[PDB]
Design a protein around this nucleic acid. Structure first.
Lengths: 69, 129, 123, 82, 157, 80, 205
RNA sequence: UAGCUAGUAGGUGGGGUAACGGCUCACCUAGGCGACGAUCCCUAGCUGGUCUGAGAGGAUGACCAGCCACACUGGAACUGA
RNA sequence: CCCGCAGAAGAAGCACCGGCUAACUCCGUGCCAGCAGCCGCGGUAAUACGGAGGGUGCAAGCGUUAAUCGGAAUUACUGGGCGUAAAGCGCACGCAGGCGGUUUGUUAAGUCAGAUGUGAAAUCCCCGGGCUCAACCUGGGAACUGCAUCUGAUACUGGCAA
């Protein structure tokens, strides 16, 4: 929702980076944003909800970015 | 109107040396003739007369050695607004043991060295430097 | 003078104010950095100096100077602030410390890199 | 119950003690009544390792003090004939 | 061996109908090192010519101050037009603790002791005047015995 | 002897009690000028004896009241 | 934190030789001396009073390689004691171990001397000491460890230092290196080209 | 920040108190504090000392040690030396 | 802590270089890009800007910022001023308060001298001792310049009497 939570965004998802093997984090090479892997919709439906009700980061999921050379 | 008579005394000598008067006069009192007695033994005056019966007029015969007067500079420390008392070990050495300091102990008024050699101190009255 | 007047009303200690009220005796302060722009210094020397308008942690919106050249600053960036007069700029009293948070290091500067936060080149 | 105990001073691994008369409730290195002597356990070869104030320790006996363990042992180590 | 020492050299101006013409003032202090010191102040349009003209004035204006044994004889004041130098005769102070234009005049004077402090304005011209006239009036124990007391040891202490 | 003061009687509009004032010519800490530093003490005494304006020897004792903890020894210098 | 740089460059910044690279070539000549500390050291400055205080402070520093933090401690120590601070500063500095190693001739340069001291090959007074800033206390003695003795550094130090002036307040055994140090170092027993009031004036402020 | 206080200033007597006292009530007296700054507002734990300073002072009260206060916030009492 | 093994082998940076302040040239750049504690540099030959080379300082640290005192005798007790530089109320009367001519007697409050108790330890300072040195731990002393009490001295200041 703001950039004041971006330090917690890398931290709380970094807190989630230690936990799951099949869950990676990337940072956008084109648009300065965080890219999040997973297994499916439901797997990442709950991880946003895992981050909100434990770490107060109300994450908002959108489609990343295209390169467009 | 004449709060400090002692400050009058030293300033009468101070201006007397500046104006090169041969002798400076003033009215006498008990303390007046005692302070002039200390300068008499020290050799800042030649001598004094204390003439009078009702208004005793202390005259002080001044002193010169060259065209420069004897008394270089003479101060006042125990002025009636900032009365200052010092102990025996805290007596001052005016002009670093060269000049003298009039100080009043309980056994009379004397120099700083005579009082320190007596083992007691008192009211430092003025700096004869 | 006249000592009994100093008894009745003593010596007023001439306390001074420090020129940097970022925070009450503090080395560095974290700010949010809104409104980055450029302004013009006064008459004896002219340029277009870079200035950020930062709201500090404890409220207290102030300005700060952007040292070096080529900063990747924007509308919102958590940065760090250290005090210092930028005399040629009127009313700018702080310096953003490059080597800190979202205000990154200067594009290669081999001389005096303790300020501007450039690392030592590899060898 | 005033006692005669040891208070530890010095640095890490190189201790030092000064045997002190204190109120037993209080802390080790804290509030004490009177220091009476000292003791060095790593007293390198100089004759001064302990200078116990024997007469006041003998005086505090009459006042009802409880001489502690090593303090009594140091009196047995530094005898009453030397 | 007479220890000439330049103190401060600075430019001046006159501003006549044409341009403004600059000149050069020179401040030097000479003293052999045994109680005879003197200052000089001359100006010309060329810096080697400036300190040369100030050297002639400093040489013909020596002053005997008499300096009892490496230190001063008693604490002195030397106030002169804003300059407000104070000197306390540090008995074996071992070093001349003084700034510019107080050390320099006292280095060639003959003392290795006494610390000094210049209060007020520290303008080099008026402060060199301030140290010298202070040393002009510093009386000797033989001097005060000749005008007071007459017993040299008891007047010493 | 024992600790006893001199004082001066000030407020005697009450019964079996007195507020005395004792003068202290202390030296000022920083300016060296002697100041007439006053000190007022609620002092207990016996049955109503004196009036205002008289120096009164007074010594420390038990806290007889909330504030009165001194006792009047004797009254000196009766005046108008 | 020792010096670890090109050596005689400090001597060309000081003009004269401070005997820093004595060694085998006991003639200095291959140094391009005194007028080339750098690309623009072929000239002369007006050299202000602050500089002449500092350059004199640098010379007494560079003979013994004392860093400023360590150097300032001596000024705090010299002014603490009695006597003259100009005399006390050099006196406590003469008591450094490598200074007495050099004065007894166990080392031809201080860098060569300290390499012996730091590698604990010297049994001063009955105890081997590896810290060169050890005060060699008055009326004492200093020996060298026999089990690391005479490995061609000691003999060359024995050769050259016996050509150089033969110091005064101490005795060298000269056969098997048994140094004895006797008295207090006096101001008259010095190199004497150094000044002293240049230093204690700079350290007042 | 010019007046302030009404168990408030003191007496007497009962009770209370480990012990003293408006400590707590009864009745009486009409007083007590205040320009050497009372009352009020803001800030602060105090000291030995630390730092600096030539000294006098200025700033400060971390660590170590003495003291005081608090123990989630507010109030009360028990037990027991 | 000691004894032996292998090998210069495994271990040097950060700031500044116009004046203040120790230490300079060249190239790029042209009031731009930027530097800066202060004064101030840059308008096409910049020792001040950035990059090299050179040189200086300090050192396992070195600078930047913040902080306090210093310098600041720019709160001046020691130790400042007030005609024009900031500052005599527009002037006057006067209570509190501050200070107070001269002489004797008296008191000893202030004052000064001596003694006593205490001024906790540590810390700080001096002559010593122990860790290889040092920081550091540590022995005695000095010190804690104070405060309170007691016994005296009677000049000076105060209180009282004339």
């Amino acid at each position: 929702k703001t950039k004041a939570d971006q330090e917690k965004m890398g931290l709380a998802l970094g807190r989630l980076a230690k936990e799951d093997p099949s869950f990676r984090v990337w940072t956008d090479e084109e648009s300065n944003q965080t890219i999040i892997a997973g297994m499916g919709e439901l797997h990442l439906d709950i991880i946003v909800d895992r981050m909100k009700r434990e770490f107060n980061v109300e994450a908002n999921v959108g489609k990343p970015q295209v390169a467009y050379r | 109107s004449m709060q400090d008579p002692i400050a009058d005394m030293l300033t009468r000598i101070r201006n007397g040396q500046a104006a090169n008067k041969a002798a400076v006069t003033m009215p006498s009192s008990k303390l007046k003739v005692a302070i002039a007695n200390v300068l008499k033994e020290e050799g800042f005056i030649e001598d004094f007369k204390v003439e009078g019966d009702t208004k005793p007029e202390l005259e002080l015969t001044l002193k010169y050695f060259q065209g420069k007067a004897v008394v270089e500079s003479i101060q006042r420390v125990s002025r009636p607004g900032l009365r200052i008392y010092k102990r025996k070990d805290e007596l001052p050495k005016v002009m670093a043991g060269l000049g003298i300091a009039v100080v009043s102990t309980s056994k009379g008024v004397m120099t700083d060295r005579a009082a320190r050699q007596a083992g007691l101190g008192g009211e430092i009255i003025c700096y004869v430097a | 003078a006249t000592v009994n007047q100093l008894v009745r009303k003593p010596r007023a200690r001439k306390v001074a104010k420090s020129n940097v009220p970022a925070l009450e005796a503090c080395p560095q302060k974290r700010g949010v950095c809104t409104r980055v722009y450029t302004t013009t210094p006064k008459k004896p020397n002219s340029a277009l100096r870079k200035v950020c308008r930062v709201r500090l942690t404890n409220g207290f919106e102030v300005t700060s100077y952007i040292g070096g050249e080529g900063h990747n600053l924007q509308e919102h960036s958590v940065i760090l602030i250290r005090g210092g007069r930028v005399k040629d700029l009127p009313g700018v009293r702080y310096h953003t410390v490059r080597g800190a948070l979202d205000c990154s290091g200067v594009k290669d500067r081999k001389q005096a890199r303790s300020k501007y936060g450039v690392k030592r080149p590899k060898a | 119950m005033v006692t005669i105990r040891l208070a530890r001073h010095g640095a890490k691994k190189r201790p030092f003690y000064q045997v002190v008369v204190a109120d037993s409730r209080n802390a080790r290195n804290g509030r004490f009544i009177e220091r009476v002597g000292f003791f060095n356990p790593i007293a390198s070869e100089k004759e001064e390792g302990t200078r116990l104030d024997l007469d006041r320790i003998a005086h505090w006996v009459g006042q009802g003090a409880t001489i502690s363990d090593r303090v009594a042992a140091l009196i047995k180590e530094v005898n009453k004939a030397a | 061996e007479l220890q000439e020492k330049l103190i401060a050299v600075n430019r001046v101006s006159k501003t006549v109908k044409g341009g403004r013409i600059f000149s050069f003032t020179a401040l030097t202090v000479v003293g052999d090192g045994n109680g005879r010191v003197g200052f000089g102040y001359g100006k010309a349009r060329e810096v080697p010519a400036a300190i040369q003209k100030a050297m002639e004035k400093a040489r013909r204006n020596m002053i005997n101050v008499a300096l009892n044994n490496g230190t001063l004889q008693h604490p002195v004041k030397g106030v002169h037009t804003g300059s407000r130098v104070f000197m306390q005769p540090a008995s074996e102070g071992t070093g001349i603790i003084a700034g510019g234009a107080m050390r320099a005049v006292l280095e060639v004077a003959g003392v290795h002791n006494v610390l000094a402090k210049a209060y007020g304005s520290t303008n080099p011209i008026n402060v060199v005047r301030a140290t010298i006239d202070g040393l002009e009036n510093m009386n000797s124990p033989e001097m005060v015995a000749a005008k007071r007391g007459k017993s040299v040891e008891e007047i010493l202490g | 002897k024992i600790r006893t003061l001199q004082g001066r009687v000030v407020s005697d509009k009450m019964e079996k009690s007195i507020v005395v004032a004792i003068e202290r010519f202390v030296k000022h800490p920083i300016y060296g000028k002697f100041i007439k530093r006053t000190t007022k003490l609620h002092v207990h005494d016996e049955n109503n004896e004196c009036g205002i304006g008289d120096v009164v020897e007074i010594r420390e004792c038990r806290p007889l009241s909330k504030t009165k903890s001194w006792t009047l020894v004797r009254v000196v210098e009766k005046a108008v | 934190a020792r010096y670890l740089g090109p050596k005689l460059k400090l001597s060309r910044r000081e003009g004269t030789d401070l005997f820093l690279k004595s060694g085998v070539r006991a003639i200095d000549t291959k140094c391009k001396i005194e007028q080339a500390p750098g690309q623009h050291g072929a000239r002369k400055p007006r050299l202000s009073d602050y500089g002449v205080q500092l350059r004199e402070k640098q010379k007494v520093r560079r003979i013994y390689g004392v860093l400023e933090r360590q150097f300032r401690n001596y000024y705090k120590e010299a002014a603490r004691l009695k006597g003259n601070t100009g005399e006390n500063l050099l006196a406590l500095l003469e008591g450094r171990l490598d200074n007495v190693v050099y004065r007894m001739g166990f080392g031809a340069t201080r860098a060569e001397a300290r390499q012996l001291v730091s590698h604990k090959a010297i049994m001063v007074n009955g105890r081997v000491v590896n810290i060169a800033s050890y005060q060699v206390s008055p009326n004492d003695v200093v020996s060298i460890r026999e089990k690391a003795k005479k490995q061609s550094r000691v003999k060359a130090a024995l050769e050259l230092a016996e050509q150089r002036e033969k110091p005064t307040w101490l005795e060298v055994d000269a056969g098997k290196m048994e140094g004895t140090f006797k008295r207090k170092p006096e101001r008259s027993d010095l190199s004497a080209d150094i000044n002293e009031h240049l230093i204690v004036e700079l350290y007042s402020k």
